[PDB]
Motif scaffolding. Structure first.
Motif, mmCIF file in Angstrom:
data_model
loop_
_atom_site.group_PDB
_atom_site.id
_atom_site.type_symbol
_atom_site.label_atom_id
_atom_site.label_comp_id
_atom_site.label_asym_id
_atom_site.label_seq_id
_atom_site.Cartn_x
_atom_site.Cartn_y
_atom_site.Cartn_z
ATOM 1 N N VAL A 39 7.009 6.338 -2.649
ATOM 2 C CA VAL A 39 7.287 4.924 -2.410
ATOM 3 C C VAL A 39 6.568 4.432 -1.145
ATOM 4 O O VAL A 39 5.986 3.345 -1.134
ATOM 5 C CB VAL A 39 8.807 4.642 -2.418
ATOM 6 C CG1 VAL A 39 9.091 3.196 -2.130
ATOM 7 C CG2 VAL A 39 9.372 4.979 -3.780
ATOM 8 N N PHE A 40 6.572 5.256 -0.102
ATOM 9 C CA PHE A 40 5.753 4.973 1.065
ATOM 10 C C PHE A 40 4.334 4.628 0.638
ATOM 11 O O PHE A 40 3.844 3.556 0.998
ATOM 12 C CB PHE A 40 5.718 6.142 2.038
ATOM 13 C CG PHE A 40 4.840 5.904 3.242
ATOM 14 C CD1 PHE A 40 5.385 5.445 4.431
ATOM 15 C CD2 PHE A 40 3.474 6.148 3.187
ATOM 16 C CE1 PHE A 40 4.593 5.223 5.540
ATOM 17 C CE2 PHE A 40 2.665 5.934 4.295
ATOM 18 C CZ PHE A 40 3.227 5.465 5.475
ATOM 19 N N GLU A 41 3.683 5.516 -0.131
ATOM 20 C CA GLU A 41 2.301 5.281 -0.555
ATOM 21 C C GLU A 41 2.132 4.006 -1.360
ATOM 22 O O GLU A 41 1.208 3.243 -1.107
ATOM 23 C CB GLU A 41 1.737 6.445 -1.349
ATOM 24 C CG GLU A 41 1.327 7.671 -0.511
ATOM 25 C CD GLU A 41 1.467 9.020 -1.293
ATOM 26 O OE1 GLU A 41 1.343 9.046 -2.558
ATOM 27 O OE2 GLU A 41 1.708 10.058 -0.621
ATOM 28 N N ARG A 42 3.020 3.753 -2.315
ATOM 29 C CA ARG A 42 2.903 2.529 -3.114
ATOM 30 C C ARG A 42 3.057 1.247 -2.298
ATOM 31 O O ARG A 42 2.362 0.258 -2.566
ATOM 32 C CB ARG A 42 3.916 2.511 -4.232
ATOM 33 C CG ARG A 42 3.919 3.771 -5.055
ATOM 34 C CD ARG A 42 4.366 3.466 -6.458
ATOM 35 N NE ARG A 42 5.192 4.560 -6.909
ATOM 36 C CZ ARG A 42 6.083 4.464 -7.877
ATOM 37 N NH1 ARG A 42 6.270 3.308 -8.499
ATOM 38 N NH2 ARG A 42 6.803 5.530 -8.197
ATOM 39 N N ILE A 43 3.958 1.249 -1.312
ATOM 40 C CA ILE A 43 4.179 0.046 -0.518
ATOM 41 C C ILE A 43 2.991 -0.206 0.409
ATOM 42 O O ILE A 43 2.360 -1.280 0.377
ATOM 43 C CB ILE A 43 5.507 0.108 0.253
ATOM 44 C CG1 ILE A 43 6.679 -0.079 -0.728
ATOM 45 C CG2 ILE A 43 5.520 -0.943 1.361
ATOM 46 C CD1 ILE A 43 8.018 0.349 -0.192
#
Lengths: 95, 106, 82, 97
Positions: A39-43
DNA sequence: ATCAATATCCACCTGCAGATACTACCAAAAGTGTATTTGGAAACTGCTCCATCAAAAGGCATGTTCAGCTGAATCAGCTGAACATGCCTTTTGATGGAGCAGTTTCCAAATACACTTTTGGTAGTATCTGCAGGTGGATATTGAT
């Protein structure tokens, strides 16, 4: 003997907050760690793109905010946006 | 000497999240609100899933959340299921689901 | 003669689309189903484009807004910029 | 008195539309629909002409392709008539449902 | 419905693998605090290009009629499920060595300026043309008898 960081102690803290008498297996933790990174990467990614599209070289809490809205489904977004706004406001008024 | 995490009222590490934003090549600059806001979303999401996984653990007379419980949590929740609709939780299995016409007699 | 907007996506139009799709014979209930489908498609895409608009502090949705929206929905479009 | 058999003209229309690339939905009605849907997200919006166009191109591409899978689904079931359950099965397998 | 095979459900039960614990250290985080740079918001405005609308265009709503498609019913043929049987192959626990990975030394390559030159994009203007439509005339396709 190189240092490998994770979100494990933090996942554990939050875990105790919500279910004080529940533990977590190391494989479950691993999955938990993967989910946060994911989720870090997607945001961060959308944030990254968003900035570019607007000829901006800075990622601000505003970028993260649109990213969250673009990425998350209906009700999760609404609640994430509260929690983040909240954290910032609280952070701003605290120095 | 107060951490930014406590300054924002967060368990998740704002310092770390500020850092990974820089190292990760997402833009020239990173604003100071950014990692606070993100760490908050990160913490919220993980709370939401642990709440639900905790419940599946209890529904199952277990005390320790294992991958199946995370899978039950995610798959049973419309929104978490969409968020993670193209993600595979190792050792999670599937939701019990048999199609109607498959059941015996009539 | 007040008519709903979605209904302005007419039978002959949906028929034509099916045609390009290579559909020979169409059940009467398709036209309503297709309308539903198109609505969910447009919501999903527009929602995202406008979100791009609000981010840019505009009151106009730009083709780039739409194009960016399509790209993140996995429906990349060529022809309109980017 | 002259009459073409059911599906004769249909075939002829498949051939026509497969050859061409013009949009098959009338611009205006589509335009309203776009604006109506948008109104629920933000009010008093204006639309670049190209923006509507892009949306239409995308929407038609999408629906034309969904009809192909739909058709495959009808043929799978040994029919030649597309039915909502066909659209439904296609969308489920595409992972849209 | 009743009788009986066999799966399914708990309940309790021991071992133990994996989790939780703690003590000590420490490298690298994270914070702190100071001096230095600038990204972008804020504010003014010019001119696209957008919503609107009036006149021209031409696509579609309409109801009828029946071709032919879909789905129900029926049924024979055989495929695929169950299960019994006989035993091979995988699983599990134990022990030498390839290569990953951690540290340090060193230089070819990339960043950071700055200045000197060019090219690619706009724009005004004018210049050019491939082809979408229209025509006309033959021939093919489809459907009727």
């Amino acid at each position: 003997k190189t240092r490998k960081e994770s979100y494990a102690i933090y996942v554990y803290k939050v875990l105790k907050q919500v279910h004080p008498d529940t533990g977590i297996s190391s494989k479950a933790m691993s999955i938990m760690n993967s989910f946060v990174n994911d989720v870090f990467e997607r945001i961060a990614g959308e944030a990254s793109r968003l900035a570019h599209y607007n000829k901006r070289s800075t990622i601000t809490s505003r970028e993260i905010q649109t990213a969250v809205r673009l990425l998350l489904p209906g009700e999760l977004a609404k609640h994430a946006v509260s929690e983040g706004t909240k954290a910032v406001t609280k952070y701003t008024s605290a120095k | 000497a107060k951490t930014r995490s406590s300054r924002a009222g967060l368990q998740f590490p704002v310092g770390r999240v500020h850092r990974l934003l820089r190292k990760g090549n997402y833009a020239e600059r990173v604003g100071a609100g950014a990692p606070v806001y993100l760490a908050a979303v990160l913490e919220y999401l993980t709370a939401e899933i642990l709440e639900l996984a905790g419940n599946a653990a209890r529904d199952n007379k277990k005390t320790r959340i294992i991958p199946r419980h995370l899978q039950l949590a995610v798959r049973n929740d419309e929104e978490l299921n969409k968020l993670l609709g193209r993600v595979t939780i190792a050792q999670g299995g599937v939701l019990p689901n048999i199609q109607s016409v498959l059941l015996p007699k009539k | 003669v007040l008519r709903d907007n979605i209904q302005g996506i007419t039978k002959p139009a949906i028929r034509r689309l099916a045609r390009r799709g290579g559909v020979k014979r169409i059940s009467g209930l398709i036209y309503e189903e297709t309308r539903g489908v198109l609505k969910v498609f447009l919501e999903n895409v527009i929602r995202d484009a406008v979100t791009y608009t609000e981010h840019a502090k505009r009151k106009t949705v730009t083709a780039m807004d739409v194009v960016y929206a399509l790209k993140r929905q996995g429906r990349t479009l060529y022809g309109f910029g980017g | 008195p002259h009459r073409y058999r059911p599906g004769t003209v249909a075939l002829r229309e498949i051939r026509r539309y497969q050859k061409s690339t013009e949009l098959l939905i009338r611009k205006l009605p589509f335009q309203r629909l776009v604006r109506e849907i948008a109104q629920d997200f933000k009010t008093d919006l204006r639309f670049q002409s190209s923006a509507v166009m892009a949306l239409q191109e995308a929407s038609e591409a999408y629906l034309v392709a969904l009809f192909e899978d739909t058709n495959l689904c009808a043929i799978h079931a040994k029919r030649v008539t597309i039915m909502p359950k066909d659209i439904q099965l296609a969308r489920r397998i595409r992972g849209e449902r």
